[PDB]
Design an enzyme around this catalytic site. Structure first.
Site, PDB file in Angstrom:
ATOM      1  N   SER A   1     -11.896  22.534 -16.966  1.00 47.33           N
ATOM      2  CA  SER A   1     -10.739  21.792 -16.499  1.00 47.33           C
ATOM      3  C   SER A   1      -9.530  22.645 -15.838  1.00 47.33           C
ATOM      4  O   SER A   1      -9.418  23.658 -16.779  1.00 47.33           O
ATOM      5  CB  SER A   1     -10.512  20.516 -17.384  1.00 47.33           C
ATOM      6  OG  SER A   1     -11.137  19.603 -17.420  1.00 47.33           O
ATOM      7  N   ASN A   2      -8.805  22.346 -15.173  1.00 47.92           N
ATOM      8  CA  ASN A   2      -7.650  22.879 -14.870  1.00 47.92           C
ATOM      9  C   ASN A   2      -6.428  22.045 -15.055  1.00 47.92           C
ATOM     10  O   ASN A   2      -6.497  20.860 -14.381  1.00 47.92           O
ATOM     11  CB  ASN A   2      -7.391  23.526 -13.719  1.00 47.92           C
ATOM     12  CG  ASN A   2      -8.512  24.506 -13.102  1.00 47.92           C
ATOM     13  OD1 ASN A   2      -9.035  25.208 -14.285  1.00 47.92           O
ATOM     14  ND2 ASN A   2      -9.168  24.468 -12.022  1.00 47.92           N
ATOM     15  N   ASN A 269      -9.007  25.427 -20.281  1.00 43.84           N
ATOM     16  CA  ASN A 269      -9.883  25.345 -21.365  1.00 43.84           C
ATOM     17  C   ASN A 269      -9.753  26.594 -22.225  1.00 43.84           C
ATOM     18  O   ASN A 269     -10.371  26.766 -23.092  1.00 43.84           O
ATOM     19  CB  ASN A 269     -11.163  25.334 -20.953  1.00 43.84           C
ATOM     20  CG  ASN A 269     -11.620  23.964 -20.072  1.00 43.84           C
ATOM     21  OD1 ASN A 269     -12.244  23.885 -18.943  1.00 43.84           O
ATOM     22  ND2 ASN A 269     -10.784  22.833 -20.515  1.00 43.84           N
TER      23      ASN A 269
END
Ligand SMILES: O=c1onc2n1-c1cc(Br)ccc1OC2
Lengths: 546, 164
Positions: A1-2, A269
């Site tokens: 994820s970002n 992450n």
């Protein structure tokens, strides 16, 4: 994820802005779903949620946008048990022999003959939780076994927590609501509000152990590799109790990383450490956050976010839609030099051509250079001392960098890796002139849709994980729910897509409509106000009761 | 009863649920979700109930790629009646109501479904759901960063025999 949250000091409008780009499965129990929830007067929130949950998980409201990424914090601990030397079904705590408990479960199995039969299975449990076996790593022999204490088994607060987040007014309110309840299981939280605050919280349920207990309570062999493991033969290695924690044995909120800024916070992450390098987050428990080298996605984002130029919504969008393979920045320049140094080596010809022609992207129209680069990098990853500049704690943003081609053994191993990579790429049946989009697809019924993006491990911000199926790479996870939120005067302006579309059912009108758009990278309005909703030429309405 | 919701859908089938309370809000959510994803939720509920082997046999896997029988053993262990009851007893009135409405809304869609957007119509595992099933799903997600990652390991954990 970002996730990127931008504050008043860096946004082009002096207000908050949030990019939400979670990387989650495209199928199954973690498949995001868009919805907008309103109880007029006291709740109005829109975003996306996981299957079966009557709350919004990642979303926005009138003055606030929030998102999540998977944290690096530990949410359980393994306990190495010392077994009773006379009985491997008993274990020692403070030198006293305790029996394991047994919980049997019965499962119905549909047989070849279409009939059911009953299977009974015994689950062994210690005072810490159930025993676990990883053959060859965590065995259950006559000397030792391993039990697992999961911190979230007692977290009954998770749904209340997101319902509370859904009701949050601004960043300060969101922070109070999360720190009060501590119901978040395993994610970071990043947020921006209208006033221009940018929040990062590493606020989740984490096993608590007082700092002085770690050196003797850790299992030294297992902590090296980052597995949370404690000595289960000593009662003093129980999780520590602190009355300020919302749940017995978890880390109090005041001891978890939080960064509140007006410029930016980001996470991809990695740990809390370099959320914003101007203000490193340090000195936390190893169960919480460690100063480890950051992945290429975070490194990419930081390279785009550092400096003094204002950040526009468009900038954050294009960080996703550029599909830049950031890992290429570290190795491709030197890889191309080695290619030039080996002109007229037949085995390297096609690979070097592809790589020199390559746009360094994971776009639909990106050349086969990407495929060569991927297979090379998989081999490069397993070579020792091949970096020109290895990871440097004092330059965590710019290292590792380059290939140590001046070392003759490295130059030999890198060239060999490239030859091995090329052979493998050429074995597979890739048609001549074929592009990345010809290979990576999402299947929709009997059709296919080309999907841009690439594996996050290659530093593609638009992370897409795929697996080989017949003649193609089938997308299984990555970019999922996208929301980009700003706060102009009229109301929240939200832009994005759900990559795999609203419906998992092939019969649905909404099985692939957003997937077609994701292919072409055409993000859309996320309508939130009654005005926005009413302007929609596709508007439909149904009222139901029972 | 006392369940009511107004649902607007915008482009791409995004629902906008308005209700006067949590029960009605849940009712709208569960209904709109079922319209798009009834079969997915039914499948994941079977998994979280530890019933994959019952419906699909021991060959084949859950959507998390676990073999059916080990997956079932893990979820039967995780979602024991006492664990669900304690979890439920700890829920606030607002959350209980959200879940009660969700289940009722999902079930309403199931009662009316003619196959227009539901491919698994008629399958024995496409069934009315209860609030406990929603707790099963929640707890399954709860442990995704913990014991969930050790599901296979838990199933494999057996004491030594006579070996050297
Ligand atoms: O929103 C809810 O409600 N229960 C859960 N949950 C979660 C959402 C996300 Br996104 C990640 C982890 C979650 O833990 C389980």
């Amino acid at each position: 994820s970002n996730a990127i949250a931008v504050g008043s000091e860096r946004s082009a409008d002096g207000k908050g802005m949030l990019l939400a780009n979670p990387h989650f499965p495209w199928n199954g129990a973690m498949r995001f779903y868009q919805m907008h929830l309103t109880i007029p007067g006291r709740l109005d929130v829109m975003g996306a949620s996981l299957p079966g949950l009557p709350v919004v998980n990642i979303g926005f409201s009138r003055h606030l946008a929030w998102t999540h990424t998977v944290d690096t914090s530990s949410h359980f601990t393994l306990y190495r048990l010392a077994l009773d030397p006379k009985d491997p079904r008993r274990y020692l705590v403070d030198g006293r022999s305790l029996p394991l408990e047994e919980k049997s479960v019965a499962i119905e199995v549909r047989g070849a003959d279409g009939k059911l039969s009953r299977v009974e299975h015994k689950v062994y449990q210690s005072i810490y939780g159930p025993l676990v076996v990883w053959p060859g790593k965590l065995d259950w022999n006559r000397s030792e076994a391993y039990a697992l204490r999961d911190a979230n088994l007692e977290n009954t607060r998770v749904l209340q927590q997101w319902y509370s987040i859904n009701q949050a007014s601004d960043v300060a309110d969101l922070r109070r609501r999360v720190e009060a309840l501590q119901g978040i299981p395993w994610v970071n939280t990043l947020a921006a509000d209208e006033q221009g605050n940018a929040l990062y919280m590493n606020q989740s349920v984490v096993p608590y152990l007082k700092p002085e207990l770690i050196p003797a309570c850790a299992i030294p062999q297992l902590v090296a590799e980052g597995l949370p493991a404690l000595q289960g033969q000593d009662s003093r290695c129980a999780w520590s109790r602190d009355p300020a924690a919302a749940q017995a044995g978890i880390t109090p909120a005041a001891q978890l990383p939080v960064l509140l800024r007006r410029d930016f916070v980001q996470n991809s992450n990695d740990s809390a450490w370099l959320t914003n390098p101007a203000s490193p987050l340090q000195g936390f428990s190893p169960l919480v956050s460690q100063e480890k080298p950051i992945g290429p996605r975070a490194r990419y984002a930081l390279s785009r976010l550092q400096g003094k130029q204002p950040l526009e919504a468009k900038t954050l969008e294009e960080m996703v839609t550029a599909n830049h393979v950031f890992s290429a920045d570290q190795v491709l320049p030197d890889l191309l030099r080695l290619c030039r140094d080996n002109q007229g080596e037949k085995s390297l010809a096609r690979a070097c051509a592809a790589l020199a022609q390559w746009d360094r992207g994971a776009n639909l129209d990106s050349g086969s250079g990407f495929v060569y680069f991927q297979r090379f990098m998989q081999r490069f990853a397993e070579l020792d001392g091949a970096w020109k500049e290895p990871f440097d704690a004092q330059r965590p943003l710019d290292t590792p960098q380059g290939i140590a081609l001046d070392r003759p053994q490295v130059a030999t191993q890198v060239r060999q890796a490239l030859a091995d990579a090329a052979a493998e790429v050429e074995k597979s049946g890739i048609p001549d002139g074929a592009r990345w989009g010809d290979l990576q697809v999402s299947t929709r019924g009997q059709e296919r849709i080309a999907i841009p993006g690439g594996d996050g491990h290659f530093g593609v911000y638009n992370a897409i994980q795929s697996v080989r199926k017949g003649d193609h790479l089938e997308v299984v996870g990555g970019t999922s729910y996208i929301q980009l939120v700003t706060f102009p005067e009229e109301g929240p302006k939200a832009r994005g897509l759900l990559a795999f579309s609203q419906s998992s059912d092939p019969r649905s009108p909404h099985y692939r409509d957003q997937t077609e758009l994701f292919s072409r990278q055409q993000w859309q309005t996320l309508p939130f106000s009654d005005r926005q909703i009413d302007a929609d030429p596709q508007l439909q309405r149904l009222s139901i009761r029972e | 009863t006392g369940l009511a919701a107004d649902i607007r859908w915008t482009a791409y089938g995004v629902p906008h649920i308005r209700a006067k309370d949590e029960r009605g809000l849940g009712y709208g959510i569960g209904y709109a979700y079922a319209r798009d994803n009834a079969c997915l939720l039914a499948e994941e509920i079977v998994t979280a109930r530890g019933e994959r082997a019952r419906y699909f046999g021991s060959e084949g896997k859950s959507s998390a790629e676990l073999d059916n029988l080990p997956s079932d053993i893990f979820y039967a262990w995780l979602n024991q009646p006492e664990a669900l009851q304690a979890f439920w007893q700890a829920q606030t009135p607002a959350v209980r109501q959200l879940l009660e409405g969700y289940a009722a809304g999902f079930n309403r869609f199931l009662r009316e479904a003619d196959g227009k957007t539901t491919s698994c119509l008629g399958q024995p595992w496409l069934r009315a759901i209860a609030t406990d099933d929603l707790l099963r799903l929640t707890r399954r997600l709860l442990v995704e960063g913990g014991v969930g990652q050790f599901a296979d390991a838990l199933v494999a954990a057996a004491p030594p025999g006579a070996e050297k």
